[PDB]
Assembly symmetry: D2
Homo-oligomer: 491 residues x 4
Amino acid sequence: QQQQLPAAMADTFLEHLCLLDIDSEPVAARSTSIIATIGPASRSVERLKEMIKAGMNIARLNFSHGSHEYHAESIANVREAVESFAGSPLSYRPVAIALDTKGPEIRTGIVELVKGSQVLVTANTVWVDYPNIVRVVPVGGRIYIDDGLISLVVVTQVENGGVLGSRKGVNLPGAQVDLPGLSEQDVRDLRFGVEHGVDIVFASFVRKASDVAAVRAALGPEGHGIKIISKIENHEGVKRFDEILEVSDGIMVARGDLGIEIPAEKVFLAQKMMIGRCNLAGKPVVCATQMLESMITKPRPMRAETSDVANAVLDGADCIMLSGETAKGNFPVEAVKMQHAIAREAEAAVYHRQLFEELRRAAPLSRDPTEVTAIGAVEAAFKCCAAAIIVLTTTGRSAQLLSRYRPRAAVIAVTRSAQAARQVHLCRGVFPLLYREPPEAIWADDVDRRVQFGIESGKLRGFLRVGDLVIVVTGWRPGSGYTNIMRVLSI
Amino acid sequence: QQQQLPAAMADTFLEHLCLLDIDSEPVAARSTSIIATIGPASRSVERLKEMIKAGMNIARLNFSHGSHEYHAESIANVREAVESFAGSPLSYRPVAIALDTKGPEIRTGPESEVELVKGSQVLVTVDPAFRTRGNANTVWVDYPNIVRVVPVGGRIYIDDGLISLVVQKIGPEGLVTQVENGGVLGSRKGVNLPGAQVDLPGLSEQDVRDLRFGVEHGVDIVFASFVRKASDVAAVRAALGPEGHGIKIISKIENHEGVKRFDEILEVSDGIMVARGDLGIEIPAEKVFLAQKMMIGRCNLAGKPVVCATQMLESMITKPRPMRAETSDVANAVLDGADCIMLSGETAKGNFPVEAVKMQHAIAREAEAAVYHRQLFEELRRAAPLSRDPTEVTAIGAVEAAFKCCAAAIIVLTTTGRSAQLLSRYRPRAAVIAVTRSAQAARQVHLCRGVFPLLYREPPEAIWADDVDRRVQFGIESGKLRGFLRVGDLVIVVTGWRPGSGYTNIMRVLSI
Amino acid sequence: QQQQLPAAMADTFLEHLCLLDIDSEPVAARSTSIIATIGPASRSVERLKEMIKAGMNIARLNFSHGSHEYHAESIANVREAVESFAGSPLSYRPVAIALDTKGPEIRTGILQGGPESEVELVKGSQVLVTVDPAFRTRGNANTVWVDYPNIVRVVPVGGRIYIDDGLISLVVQKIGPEGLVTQVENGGVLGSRKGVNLPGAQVDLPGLSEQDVRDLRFGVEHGVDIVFASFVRKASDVAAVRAALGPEGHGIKIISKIENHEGVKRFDEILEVSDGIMVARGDLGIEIPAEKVFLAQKMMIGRCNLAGKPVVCATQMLESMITKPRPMRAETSDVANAVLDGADCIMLSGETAKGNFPVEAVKMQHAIAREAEAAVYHRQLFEELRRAAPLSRDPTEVTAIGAVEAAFKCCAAAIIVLTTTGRSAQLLSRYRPRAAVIAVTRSAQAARQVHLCRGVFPLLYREPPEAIWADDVDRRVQFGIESGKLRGFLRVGDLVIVVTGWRPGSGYTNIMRVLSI
Amino acid sequence: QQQQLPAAMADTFLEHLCLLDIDSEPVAARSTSIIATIGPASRSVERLKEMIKAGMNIARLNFSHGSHEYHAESIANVREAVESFAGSPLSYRPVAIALDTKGPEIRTGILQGGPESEVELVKGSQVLVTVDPAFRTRGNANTVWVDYPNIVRVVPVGGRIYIDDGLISLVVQKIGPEGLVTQVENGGVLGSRKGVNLPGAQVDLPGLSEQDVRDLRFGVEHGVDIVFASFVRKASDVAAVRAALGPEGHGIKIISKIENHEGVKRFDEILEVSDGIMVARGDLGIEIPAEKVFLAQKMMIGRCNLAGKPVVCATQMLESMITKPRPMRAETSDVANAVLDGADCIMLSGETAKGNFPVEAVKMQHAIAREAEAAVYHRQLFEELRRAAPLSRDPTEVTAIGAVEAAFKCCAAAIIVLTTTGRSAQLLSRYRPRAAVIAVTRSAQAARQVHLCRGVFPLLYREPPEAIWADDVDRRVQFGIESGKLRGFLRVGDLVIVVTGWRPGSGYTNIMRVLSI
Ligand SMILES: [K+]
Ligand SMILES: [K+]
Ligand SMILES: [K+]
Ligand SMILES: [K+]
Ligand SMILES: [Mn+2]
Ligand SMILES: [Mn+2]
Ligand SMILES: [Mn+2]
Ligand SMILES: [Mn+2]
């Protein structure tokens, strides 16, 4: 068959593994959304169009670099490239915009560190943007610079040498960095965020629930809608994951920083744990950093990078991301393309049998009519190999709860809320459709055309063929919060 | 707790995932054996000693390069470094030596980097006269029939698939092409022709000479390149000759056809190497993982070693720290079920050979503790067919007994490793300490996850019963000495009712 | 908690067993329907009213005894008792009426001098079974006449013949030119015209006599709801019954009774064609060794369950009560295990037709069934059904399963379905929701037949259809709730799943909604 | 295949149920041991021989009746019948002897010059419950004398008294000064000296009268092997029994009978202290509502299974056979479900002590148990036990589980264990191998007590020890095999798991070996 159906029907995971078939072509829209970081290499309107076709879902603005004006152009160009296919509402692909916070980053200033040499922190001199650095490093203490390559030992002795450039990483383990999760800058940044209507915030170095309360606050009332994604970048964040989660809209497994703050051998446990948990919680999780680095420079990924992406997806990740691969490398589109291609395969390899079982089995009872509908809708879909679940949603919550259970059928989410449509990419397998029509006199009719719109757009992009069954999820009255109906229709 | 015990006790895989704890230190010998490739960077006796300390179990000799003499030194140095710790039998680590076959390779026609422009014109000559005359527009190539198999609109890849050539004028003197993916070309690099039915045989006159060399110098294992079908290994066994029935044959799966005929290849090989390198060119990059996952699954089910290889840690050929992906690569290989993981450029030529070995060690230990044994043992028991081989019966009893008392180890007496191999099939968490008189057996056993071989030197006792006991005692002692076993641990001990192989049938529970 | 909820939440069956709590009161309409057999003891209209209150869902007419007239009173009385509560539509309980076919009886003769006389067959004495037409009547201490000619042809030298409800037994020691020269194995008192069973040996006699045919016609005439068809041995045997049933009776459900080795052996093919199965332990417990029935019973139920077709457990579930006011320790467990096995219906024969404790017996089955119903490890059971029922593209099935899943998620008190033939109700019950299936229908007959499905509670809707189809649907749902409140299936604050369709007429169920009371 | 092997290999319980095959003959010694109660009908040496052949493993002496002398003959005859086959050590079957305590019972009194005579407590009539010593012998239709002085002090107005298997029932409505004036609720034939129970009212009677104590001592003198201890309500109740038992009886196994609500409620604590459990359905089925026993039965068995301790299912499993040669459909399923529930032993009371079919009864349990034994879904059951039994560091337990795993892998015919107290055998059986546990011991007593464990088949070894310990072990193993061939547990070509220890004397089992026959 296709979509690894023989593997999907195995009675055990081992069996399932044993039936994975390289000639079994994927046959299903990829559901893992791709976040690409905007930079010199991917800023041009025209470059942006190409990245949208290759499958970019979310543009990441990295406030670790660039100016306010510099990023507004970034935002402006994304919006232009995106509005260039508004030609055709059935085909039009929304693209989220995510501000990625600078936070307690410690960086160098504007030569080779000789292992053994005496090297000061205020070839041998390193200026740091953290003045309190000399309040938090005791004697016999370690300081890591530029992606953990350069090691220093506090006056400091170099323990690991390395080539150093301008303005690069600083990480201080062991010591608890009183440096605040939110500088005066971050605050200004987040305000910029609200002004330009970013959709998502990726919040650097979150160490505790307060850290997000901070962000929400700074975000202001003009930004209740914005989703907040807490980036876990160090030992403490990991340790207090639960609490962070409870309060964040979802998580970013920030492997970069993390891979320095804690020993490299351990990330995978962190990554696997965190995704597991977000999955259980029903909240977006992003896997990030270095998934495809070699491509910053080469047109083909290395054998490890490939398996990285697949394992991220198999792990359970809602989104996968690219940094240098898209912001600066010589192969931005090719990189997007590859994640697309890999994600589809891994998506078809997911052992839904075990996965759906386990989620049902661990999600607690519930009395929210929306949740009740979702799970029934998901069960119904599996029973008839439905091609899609089509939901009418006003904030995405309804789409989000369906995706929680990981249907194999696509969630086609129909909404009037441009913003909701953009944010919904954070949820695996949700395909948003932006509805433009003015409401019908009769509420019932207005529902129908929305469902119809959903099918139609559905046919058009190849999610649905004549003869397929589709599950349709609606509510008993207008306005959000009342999803409570599930119907089975044939195309 | 430690060794991710809270995760180990979960009722589900999801739950298990959720309980994975970064502060839970591993606390167990690493089981996944490491194969390190020998090159300029790792040939010095003293380098070799260091690599043994950091955890090298198996040395790969790559017959794609170097001369017979060149490899005999390789072998001679390994053996030396290894015999340097025979000072103390309790501590001594054997090391396998693996000959890796050249096979139907195709290579380009020295510190010289011709750049093959994007959207230019390339000629592939196979003409003696141009056996080196390979500039901006010319590449020679040691496979004549390249001109014969590659049709117009066919693909020709060069050097790890990074360079791309589409044929578009098949004419009198050779292959006129166009450069799709351009790039920097080097002296003598791999060539791949997907879609083409490269008529070259799995076993050249060279491979045959190579394998004979293998037998003469007593290599322990053959990694057999480009195996496409059962016959291909029959070839190898043949060439290997009678002086080499003992040698383990590991088929490398390097292309679409091998994958397609995996079952038949497996049934005949002693194990499998998932050759991601070539495989990552022959089939689309997006797909390897399915292959890798499938083949490991299958070898697991079958009970036969499987190797994950190539590009697990490349960035380290050049940098002292792995990239985020390479790390998870290694973990997932082990989590996938791999018996061995390997290193190529990372050890043969890179600037960080030992650091590389160290890392794999460090990662493998964590992933080893992350293995959901509850689901895994259940599924193996449940798919392995009944059996009437007393050795298999004992093994599974022994593996069950071990889980029941969190035994620190199973100690087996073995003459060919078969008994150890059957214990590891089931993936005990306890270590398999394998005591043998067969130097070779002790080497080959590294191909089995979680088997720790001990080479017994003493002359046999007058009383066979006594001779067994000392062997067991020898097992314990060495065991205490390397920190596999502490006083108060329980240990499962597996022996047989009479001397000579094939009669393992007894399992005993002892306290240290 | 109640309804053995702690046991319901266990992670394994063993665990589950361990958390069974005797102080955890059931709290849920019993789902296992009860079939009570009508005889002298339970024929009076007033007796029938009492049995309806105690929980009778199905009345069995046994055509092995009584005349056409005799059964028409039977039917007339039932209907009368039942129509006596039509006073209140919210409360009204329909009752099925099931004809139980006679089929290939094999009978001894009239007894020397009497239809009322008895003879005693002493253990170890010399005994003659003849097929000699003359002694059809002259039977005694050493002789029994049988109305199956071929007997002196089908029983080997050393075979066994079971007489009178399996209580007398004979071993053929010599084959005779006039009758099988046997030895008495099990002694006993022998009556006029009693039953024979012949295990091992094949019996060719037809599954449908001239009588059965007349009976089934009588069936159609009086509008029975269900036929329990005795000795079904093969698919043809039901085709026979359908046929005989005639066109005036396509509606009738046909329940094949498996009463011997061969039926068991051909169970699959019988099932494929029957509307469900009756595990006939009586005959069965004689045609095949007594040790074995359980495997049969357990097999058949498993299989029906898998198949989504009603299965009845029957015979001797409570016999001591034909005579005593309390069941023995075994009978009790029998009932529970039947329910636990997966049974859709459980039945009573002597216990209701003739015994001194008809109502008490019905009461007991009620009481036990409720307890077992709560002990069902739904967690494993729903998992296993989902996992083995094949994909499906019937919108009704799809809706059913989603409806069932939705219910578990909010401990819904009920699923309320609108159904025209019961199909939609039947599919929900297939999956064994713990919530009740309140089925609303205009088809008096459908409401009766639906009791064959575990946990389906039928409501007969009487109102003339509304001008607006949508409105008519709503009142039906409302009617479902209201009746639901009224009998204690639903309280204010409960959640309820409602299952309807997108247009009138059967076959189009395809909508599931979540409502709060 | 046989032994329901296709069912055994199913992937789910549903599936397993579906594949149960009535033509799949069992092929395996039956494992569930049978306890038969000794009475008039089963006391004769010769009768006892027959009962041994039919499969009796444990003789129950019921100290609720008979005298010390009367029971010593009981014992003396059992031992005789049993020693009659010592002719051949390979085939010799040991037989446990179990003393069943009287405890806090409460009987009505003897009847008006009537021994085997009866009287009817008419429904609705006027009945007086006395304690007047003078009325002890004057039982009648209007008067019932009870041996419980304090009855008058505990049964308040509108309190309930029930007599003889709970069939007779009395409503106290009047407190007089010489007795309790009761209304009869459930009328009926009353006999002499029949049981009384008092639900709702706590009974200040002690678990151990001066009699019980004398009884227990008698027990130790005559070397009974097991004590079934009536009405155990709490841990203390067993401490009592142990105590009374004295030091001359540390070896005796104590089986606590759970006979009422409180025992149930405090099961855990009773278990922790008893050697095993008897689910006393009789009393229990009166103390608590009949609908609930099954939960209790199922709970207790589950829990003893989890604990590793014998559990007995008892009372009324086969009553109809006290009087008839064939069991009713429920009794049969009762036995099978008891076995499928997880019971280690099943028992017969009236069926063997007094009825007209003692041996036939034993035979039937045998026959049923074999079938149910092969129906056990080992796949789920062994998984669940591994998964719930806690880690352990006892080398004996470790070896047992390995041995049990090994056996499953090769469909071993048997695990053969050398055991001194049976503890090694008991641990193997805990995991419920499908292979038989052939237990070889020199301890006649151990060999007798081991029947309390499912699927343990004890062999008594008679030879004087060999000079060389190693050789002595081997002959014991050899003895095991040989005896095993001889009774059909093992055939040439089978695999057998053999479990031994590293040194003599109990407590050191720690070795497992795989041998081919
Ligand atoms: K940042
Ligand atoms: K090679
Ligand atoms: K009949
Ligand atoms: K007693
Ligand atoms: Mn960061
Ligand atoms: Mn290769
Ligand atoms: Mn019948
Ligand atoms: Mn009692």
